[PDB]
Every structure is written in C-alpha cells, then in structure tokens.
C-alpha cells in the first residue's frame, strides 16, 4: 500500500465504487463494437459487479438491491 502510493500517489475510491463505475462505461462502449465481442463486453460489466455484490453478501445485506 505504501509502495504502490510511492510509485503512484493516484488512487481510486474502493469499497466497490470503482467496479460499479467501470461497469457503466463498459456497458455504454459495448454499443459501439458491432461484432461478436459485444456480448463479451456486457459480460465484463456483469462480472465487475461480482466484487461489490460479494462484499454486501459477506456483510449480511441484500446483494442486488444494494448493488
């Protein structure tokens, strides 16, 4: 954590905030790829949600509603 901040002080908000924001960008950009890789890009969005959806599950909350 210290070595990473020394190599680059730039950081992203944790607690699942980064994964949920990237999933929106990946979903919108999937519309611009007219090819069979489009279904994989949407799958990348849903796969990104599993990290934050797993945190709420381990804490004892409704995953999808909190997601």
């Amino acid at each position: 954590v210290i070595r990473n901040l020394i190599r680059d002080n730039r950081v992203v908000y944790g607690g699942g905030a980064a994964e949920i924001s990237c999933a929106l960008a990946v979903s919108q950009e999937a519309d611009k790829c007219p090819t069979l890789e489009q279904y994989a890009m949407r799958a990348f969005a849903d796969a990104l949600e599993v990290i934050p959806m797993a945190l709420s599950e381990n804490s004892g909350m409704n995953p999808i509603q909190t997601m």
Binding site: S27, D31, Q65
Partner: protein, 74 residues
C-alpha cells in the same frame, strides 16, 4: 355488407380476406405502423437496457432480462 367472390382456392381467399380485415382492423384501433423483421425487438431490447441503468433495486436485473429476451425473435 357481404363480400361475394377450386374449393381450396376459395377457402384461402376467405382467409385472405379475413387476415386483411384483421390487419385493417389493427390500423383502425392503432393508426400507426412499425417495421418488421425484428426491428422493434432490437430497439425494445436496446432502449430498455438504458432505462435499467437509471432504475434501482431489483428492477434493473428484471427489466434487463426483459430486454435480452426480445433478442430471440430476430
């Protein structure tokens, strides 16, 4: 009003006139037309996925499945 017009060729003609009346009845109740060949099913699948991003709760996962289901027709 009555419409006077092989035994099989006349039967399909009655179906041809009934199906036309059904389509003509559709334009009456709904004065509009839409493209075929899976055109609305893609727009319905595309724009509903946009709404699911704005909603919250379980509706996003449910409305998204409603959108992906329309893609089976085309």
């Amino acid at each position: 009003v009555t419409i006077v017009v092989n035994k099989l060729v006349i039967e399909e003609a009655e179906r041809s006139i009934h199906d036309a009346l059904c389509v003509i009845r559709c334009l009456v109740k709904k004065r509009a037309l839409i493209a075929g060949g899976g055109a609305p099913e893609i727009e319905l699948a595309l724009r509903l996925t946009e709404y699911s991003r704005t909603l919250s709760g379980m509706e996003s996962y449910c409305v998204r499945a409603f959108a992906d289901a329309m893609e089976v027709i085309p």
